[model samples]
Target: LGKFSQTCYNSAIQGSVLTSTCERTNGGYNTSSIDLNSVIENVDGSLKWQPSNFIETCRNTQLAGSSELAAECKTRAQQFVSTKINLDDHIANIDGTLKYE
Candidate 1:
């Protein structure tokens, strides 16, 4: 097993990493498409980019027993999405009436 590097996961390496079905084209980032199946993973599992369910997959990739691969997996994940979920919008929607008894 060799080390993981950014070059191994470059979307433009072969120009086959991304596919989009949406009517709007926005410079075509890997995960810009909401469809997971549209994007193809590299033969070595290098480009695991997706708009959703990435967190579920990263959990396994990060534990694949290779520090280089794991670190690169993290890099791949962050490139498409962050691990944070903000709920301030929900907080603002809360009812103002409150009582404690």
Candidate 2:
């Protein structure tokens, strides 16, 4: 709650957060075999970084709720697993194929 920022978040919906299992290796930003969107809140929460990166950087030498903990100030920053479903991708556009009865 100090002053860090949230780096990631759930995409909103089920299975939309982009899991590593489905993405190619060296995908884009996060490449840690750990899925940031797999922790369960399971469907809508993101993490600033995977434990892999966190351990490498901080090494648990600080306290929680402190500005030193950049991830702590973030929104659901530790929730390494958020899912989403894009409803827009499935729109049928039924109006175009219909006639006025």
Best candidate according to TM-score: 1
Tell me the tens digit of each residue's lDDT in model 2 across 37-63: 222121123223222332222221222
How much lDDT does each candidate structure score? 0.24, 0.23
Deviation in Å, model 2, residue 51 alpha carbon: 30
Backbone clashes for every candidate come to 0, 10
TM-score, model 2 to reference: 0.15
lDDT of 1 at 89: 15
User: Per-residue CA lDDT of candidate 1, range 35-97, in tens?
Assistant: 222332322224443234433333332212211223122443344222221111111111221
TM-score of each: 0.16, 0.15
Top candidate by lDDT: 1
Q: What is the lDDT of residue 92 in candidate 2?
A: 18
- Which 10 consecutive residues of model 2 have the lowest summed lDDT? 92-101
What's model 1's overall lDDT? 0.24
